Amino acid sequence: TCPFYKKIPGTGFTVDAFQYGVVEGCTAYFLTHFHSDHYAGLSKHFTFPVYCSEITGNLLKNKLHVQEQYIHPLPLDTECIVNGVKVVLLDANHCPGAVMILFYLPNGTVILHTGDFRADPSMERSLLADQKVHMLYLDTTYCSPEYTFPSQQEVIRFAINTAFEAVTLNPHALVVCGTYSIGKEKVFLAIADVLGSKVGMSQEKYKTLQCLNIPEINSLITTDMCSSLVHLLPMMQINFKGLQSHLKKCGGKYNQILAFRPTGWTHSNKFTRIADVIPQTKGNISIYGIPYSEHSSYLEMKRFVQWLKPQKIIPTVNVGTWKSRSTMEKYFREWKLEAGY
Ligand code: NI
Numbered sequence: 001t002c003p004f005y006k007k008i009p010g011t012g013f014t015v016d017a018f019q020y021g022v023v024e025g026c027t028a029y030f031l032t033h034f035h036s037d038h039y040a041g042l043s044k045h046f047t048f049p050v051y052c053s054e055i056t057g058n059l060l061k062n063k064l065h066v067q068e069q070y071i072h073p074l075p076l077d078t079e080c081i082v083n084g085v086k087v088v089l090l091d092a093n094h095c096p097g098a099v100m101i102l103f104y105l106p107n108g109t110v111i112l113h114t115g116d117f118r119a120d121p122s123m124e125r126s127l128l129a130d131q132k133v134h135m136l137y138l139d140t141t142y143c144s145p146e147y148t149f150p151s152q153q154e155v156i157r158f159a160i161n162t163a164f165e166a167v168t169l170n171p172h173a174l175v176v177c178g179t180y181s182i183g184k185e186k187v188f189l190a191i192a193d194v195l196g197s198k199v200g201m202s203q204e205k206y207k208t209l210q211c212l213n214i215p216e217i218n219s220l221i222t223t224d225m226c227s228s229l230v231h232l233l234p235m236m237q238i239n240f241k242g243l244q245s246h247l248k249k250c251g252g253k254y255n256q257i258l259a260f261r262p263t264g265w266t267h268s269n270k271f272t273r274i275a276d277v278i279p280q281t282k283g284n285i286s287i288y289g290i291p292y293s294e295h296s297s298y299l300e301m302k303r304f305v306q307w308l309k310p311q312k313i314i315p316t317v318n319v320g321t322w323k324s325r326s327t328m329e330k331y332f333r334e335w336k337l338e339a340g341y
Contacts, residue, residue, distance in 0.1 A: 002020040010107060018031075020041070030113075032098060033056060033094055034056050038115075039060075044067065047067075050071055055211065059182070063208065076089050084106075085103065087104070093123075093294075095182045100112060100113060109135065110131060111136075118294055123304065135310065140301070147297060160190050162258070162288065164194045166258050167258075170256055172256065184262045188230060189220060199230045200230065201221065201223065205232055206223050209221055229254075240287075244285065247284075256285075260287075260290055263290070306335055306339040
């Protein structure tokens with residue numbers, strides 16, 4: 001059965017609710033982004049209307065085989081009527097095609113569902129500026145002050161300089177980047193660009209990237225591994241065993257691997273600056289864990305919420321324990337008393 005925080009009161013709408021069977025009274029199913037926890041349950045046998053971005057719609061059709069008649073793509077930044085209710089989709093600054101949804105309820109209440117997001121000050125100059133929000137359904141993944149990490153631009157700076165240095169010292173080094181879902185593509189794209197290479201990958205991953213509307217993509221990626229010195233591999237293979245095994249397959253073209261594991265936050269954030277980061281090393285194999293987040297830091301989240309001044313907050317992440325729920329409610333109250341709403 002569908003939980004409460006995935007229902008939109010006063011509408012026939014649900015958000016990210018495909019794993020519960022047929023939801024009683026749902027006339028339109030919204031999908032915020034193509035991440036498995038959120039799409040869990042969609043397939044070619046789905047026969048209700050799905051509302052989403054163009055990019056999410058490209059991925060439903062080609063990767064999950066959902067039939068075209070049930071895919072309803074909406075443009076961003078545009079007032080649209082769905083089943084008699086005004087909605088807007090806004091860029092979530094999460095992975096490609098990810099959105100927040102503004103719902104204008106028939107009774108005058110305004111609801112923002114963030115999906116998954118990385119709050120940014122640029123959101124304070126979207127269509128959100130214009131009006132009040134009564135309920136916020138908030139991505140609270142990192143809602144605790146210990147959760148700190150750098151900007152995405154600092155992390156990319158570190159990865160580009162690390163890769164360029166290592167391959168300039170050894171032209172026979174191979175760079176490898178881990179992936180398991182969409183998102184974080186700037187990591188491997190930026191490194192390939194500095195090195196003058198295309199990014200090499202499997203047919204399945206190439207298919208996924210071709211759904212993302214990335215400008216000039218055909219110039220940036222390929223399935224011909226031999227011609228590329230930046231390779232993608234599944235995240236589970238980013239370890240000394242998996243990487244050794246991959247170096248054997250390359251036919252004596254390379255004598256070193258430098259690899260990157262983009263993670264979310266890890267506890268080495270609590271001590272080490274991004275500048276000071278070091279790899280794990282065995283022989284001619286080195287592995288860097290880099291904290292490239294597509295979710296808000298605690299400070300980013302707090303800033304966004306203090307600016308929006310919602311009348312009520314409903315968390316959508318970390319809701320399963322009493323301790324987590326109590327912790328999050330305490331921070332929402334400090335934020336509210338500090339800013340005076
Ligand atoms: Ni996500």
